Design an enzyme around this catalytic site. Structure first.
Site, PDB file in Angstrom:
ATOM      1  N   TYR B 140       1.636  -7.466 -12.368  1.00 49.96           N
ATOM      2  CA  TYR B 140       1.012  -8.573 -13.136  1.00 49.96           C
ATOM      3  C   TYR B 140       0.462  -8.166 -14.515  1.00 49.96           C
ATOM      4  O   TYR B 140       0.608  -8.905 -15.499  1.00 49.96           O
ATOM      5  CB  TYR B 140      -0.073  -9.307 -12.329  1.00 49.96           C
ATOM      6  CG  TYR B 140      -0.530 -10.591 -12.984  1.00 49.96           C
ATOM      7  CD1 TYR B 140       0.408 -11.544 -13.436  1.00 49.96           C
ATOM      8  CD2 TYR B 140      -1.897 -10.866 -13.157  1.00 49.96           C
ATOM      9  CE1 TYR B 140      -0.013 -12.741 -14.048  1.00 49.96           C
ATOM     10  CE2 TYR B 140      -2.328 -12.056 -13.766  1.00 49.96           C
ATOM     11  CZ  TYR B 140      -1.382 -12.984 -14.208  1.00 49.96           C
ATOM     12  OH  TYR B 140      -1.803 -14.150 -14.804  1.00 49.96           O
ATOM     13  N   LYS B 181       3.745   5.644  -3.618  1.00 45.29           N
ATOM     14  CA  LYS B 181       5.163   5.702  -3.264  1.00 45.29           C
ATOM     15  C   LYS B 181       5.941   6.758  -4.057  1.00 45.29           C
ATOM     16  O   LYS B 181       7.071   6.529  -4.493  1.00 45.29           O
ATOM     17  CB  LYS B 181       5.822   4.341  -3.449  1.00 45.29           C
ATOM     18  CG  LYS B 181       6.154   3.666  -2.149  1.00 45.29           C
ATOM     19  CD  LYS B 181       7.107   4.523  -1.297  1.00 45.29           C
ATOM     20  CE  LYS B 181       7.735   3.717  -0.151  1.00 45.29           C
ATOM     21  NZ  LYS B 181       8.595   2.580  -0.638  1.00 45.29           N
ATOM     22  N   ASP B 213       3.830   3.063   3.170  1.00 37.90           N
ATOM     23  CA  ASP B 213       4.365   2.586   4.436  1.00 37.90           C
ATOM     24  C   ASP B 213       3.716   3.302   5.610  1.00 37.90           C
ATOM     25  O   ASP B 213       3.325   2.669   6.585  1.00 37.90           O
ATOM     26  CB  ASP B 213       5.883   2.689   4.489  1.00 37.90           C
ATOM     27  CG  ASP B 213       6.408   3.952   3.854  1.00 37.90           C
ATOM     28  OD1 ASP B 213       5.596   4.781   3.377  1.00 37.90           O
ATOM     29  OD2 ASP B 213       7.651   4.102   3.820  1.00 37.90           O
ATOM     30  N   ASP B 237      -4.344  -4.127  -2.374  1.00 37.09           N
ATOM     31  CA  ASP B 237      -4.505  -5.470  -1.890  1.00 37.09           C
ATOM     32  C   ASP B 237      -3.946  -5.636  -0.470  1.00 37.09           C
ATOM     33  O   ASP B 237      -4.584  -6.245   0.400  1.00 37.09           O
ATOM     34  CB  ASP B 237      -3.821  -6.449  -2.841  1.00 37.09           C
ATOM     35  CG  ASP B 237      -3.677  -7.835  -2.238  1.00 37.09           C
ATOM     36  OD1 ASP B 237      -4.694  -8.370  -1.713  1.00 37.09           O
ATOM     37  OD2 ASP B 237      -2.546  -8.383  -2.283  1.00 37.09           O
ATOM     38  N   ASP B 241      -6.339  -5.808   3.066  1.00 38.88           N
ATOM     39  CA  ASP B 241      -6.204  -6.911   4.015  1.00 38.88           C
ATOM     40  C   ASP B 241      -5.809  -6.478   5.447  1.00 38.88           C
ATOM     41  O   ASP B 241      -6.389  -6.969   6.406  1.00 38.88           O
ATOM     42  CB  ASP B 241      -5.417  -8.109   3.431  1.00 38.88           C
ATOM     43  CG  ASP B 241      -6.314  -9.020   2.511  1.00 38.88           C
ATOM     44  OD1 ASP B 241      -7.480  -8.666   2.225  1.00 38.88           O
ATOM     45  OD2 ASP B 241      -5.857 -10.092   2.049  1.00 38.88           O
TER      46      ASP B 241
END
Lengths: 355, 357
Positions: B140, B181, B213, B237, B241
């Protein structure tokens, strides 16, 4: 029907032999036989020859109706990688084969509803599939003062994957959760639009939109709400690996990856566990269950598939465990034990049995 | 005389806010000091009562304060008629507004509640971890044929975030798990590099690198391993969560967000929950526990924080529960019966004698 077998290294060769054994049994009983071609991959392909994925092999896959993969990766190639040679290999297979769809099924066995870190109250009924886009999104000099990654999806790409997602839902609970980050990602606005466009061609299927981070909360809170989830390349990586905990032992889970034109590569989700390699006690089921997948999606042989799912189902209901799914202290069998027992279950579910 | 920007919002925002406020108002008395509270419109209550989802007027007030407390935003009223230009998400308008970079979402499970979670009690009982999230960098026209997103990270952005991570690990269990990553992402190859380089500055803190992951797995197979997790905008994010579920309900959870200069915004992680607004059933602890971190980070007042934290821990050990932390068939309480009970646990914990001393 010609099949591409690639054990790789670690317990790859072990769980592969295990899968092929179960496979062979079912076909001899069912009429048809199969031609098998053997190939190196990763550590075995780095040793006995040059690249992690040789051209010599890439073509054998290409000239064949399905591919069975075991595992790759090890300590041997963790130091001295070059970051160009260590394992995957796999990418290279993925991109070399135009595989766009990743299918990771998660159906928890009643037998096993107590293996998970999650509470039996939540995992008992779950049977869902994560469908993961493989071609688009992310991916495809020390000291830099900044870095960039580009997330690129095409409308073809998204459309191509969402369709598979609806096709599969039709053979299942006719529900598709579509997971995007469309309150922030340009690509996700695109995704969700592509989504509603296809929803229309399957009016008899429920489509819901789920934000990627919610998805992650709901996979542990309430995985029973899910049938099919379709998502972009990165997210799918993360959600697969998370959903994988629902069942507990990676040793259960199978995965399929499918090509634009319908070629298949089937493999266990579990890594190479190179410690345990050679001591004949790796859980063969995943790779086994994988060949079930192959049977279904590469050749339409549905009964020959259900034959194994039905078998494996019982052997576990009997209370056979290998190391990984064994309770602590519980008795566990070896690989060939597990193997031989799974064989037994199929012959007995393919009988005459009058008198 | 230290100023506080108060931003209730909509849904149960004001409800929970008002709760947290009282608790705060009390502690100060017991402790001598007093706080000035300027109230501001935000979210739906800013779209309605003065036009824009985030009036500049308020933004200005957050700037002239010493800390911000926010409730929540969102609701059906602007779920439709959004424009994606005002769907009560000027929550971002605040992130960039006062250059918040650091998001902290702590997860430490009260034993009272080791059986309040989707995860088995065995797994979740020890856990006490913070996910530190980078807020400025990273990620973003219908009919289009393609889409692109750029993921941008600058070395500064990263240095800054990996720093506050070690700074924190020191005050906790001296572990930092850096989550990237690095095997596919460019921004992550850089990410790692900065963490290796900062870790040298803290040889008494453990550095580990962990792929995202994996991290998603590890958070549910063995959350006890984690002390501090530091990660990028998106990952952070998602992981936030996921790990929220380990406590179980969101009503239990505080969050802070920090700026370069050290301005602070404390808000409950839990949402608007528009369905139970006005009906005094909402769990005010998160918002309270948030005002707690506020005392800690924005004002150094460590005892006043500990005051609230343990007071709350008690009220749970006792047997109080609201709708959301109650096992079914067990009895729950109202917001105020929750608030008041906590107010009490501050006064009796400010008892200073043992038939002796």
């Amino acid at each position: 029907k010609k099949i591409a077998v690639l054990p790789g290294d670690g317990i790859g060769p072990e769980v592969m032999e295990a899968a092929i054994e179960v496979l062979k049994a079912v076909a001899e009983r069912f009429g048809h036989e199969f031609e098998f071609e053997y190939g190196l991959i990763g550590g075995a392909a780095i040793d006995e020859a040059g690249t992690p994925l040789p051209e010599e092999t890439l073509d054998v896959c290409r000239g064949s109706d399905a591919i069975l993969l075991g595992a790759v990766g090890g300590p041997k190639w963790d130091q001295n990688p070059s970051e160009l040679r260590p394992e995957k290999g796999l990418l290279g297979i993925r991109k070399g084969l135009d595989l766009f769809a990743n299918l990771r099924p998660v159906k928890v066995y009643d037998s096993l509803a107590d293996a998970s870190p999650l509470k039996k109250e939540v995992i008992e009924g779950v049977d869902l599939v994560i469908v993961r886009e493989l071609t688009g999104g992310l991916y495809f000099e020390e000291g830099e003062e900044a870095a960039v990654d580009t997330l690129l999806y095409t409308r073809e790409e998204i459309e191509r994957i969402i369709r598979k997602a609806f096709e599969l839902a039709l053979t299942r609970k006719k529900k598709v959760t579509s997971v995007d980050k469309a309150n922030v990602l340009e690509s996700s606005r695109l995704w969700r639009e592509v989504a509603e466009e296809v929803a229309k061609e399957y009016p008899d299927v429920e489509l819901e939109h789920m934000l990627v981070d919610n998805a992650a909360m709901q996979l542990i809170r309430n995985p029973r709400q899910f049938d099919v989830i379709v998502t972009e390349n990165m997210f799918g990586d993360i959600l697969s690996d998370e959903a994988s905990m629902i069942t507990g032992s990676l040793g259960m889970l199978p995965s399929a990856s499918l090509s634009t034109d319908g070629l298949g590569l089937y493999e266990p989700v579990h890594g190479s566990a190179p410690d345990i390699a050679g001591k004949g006690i790796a859980n063969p089921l995943a790779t086994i269950l994988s060949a079930a997948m192959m049977l279904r999606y590469s050749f339409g042989l549905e009964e020959e598939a259900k034959a194994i799912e039905k078998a494996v189902e019982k052997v576990l209901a009997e209370g056979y465990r290998t190391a990984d799914i064994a309770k602590p202290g519980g008795k566990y069998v070896s690989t060939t034990e597990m193997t031989d027992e799974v064989k037994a279950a199929v012959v007995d579910e393919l009988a005459t049995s009058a008198i």
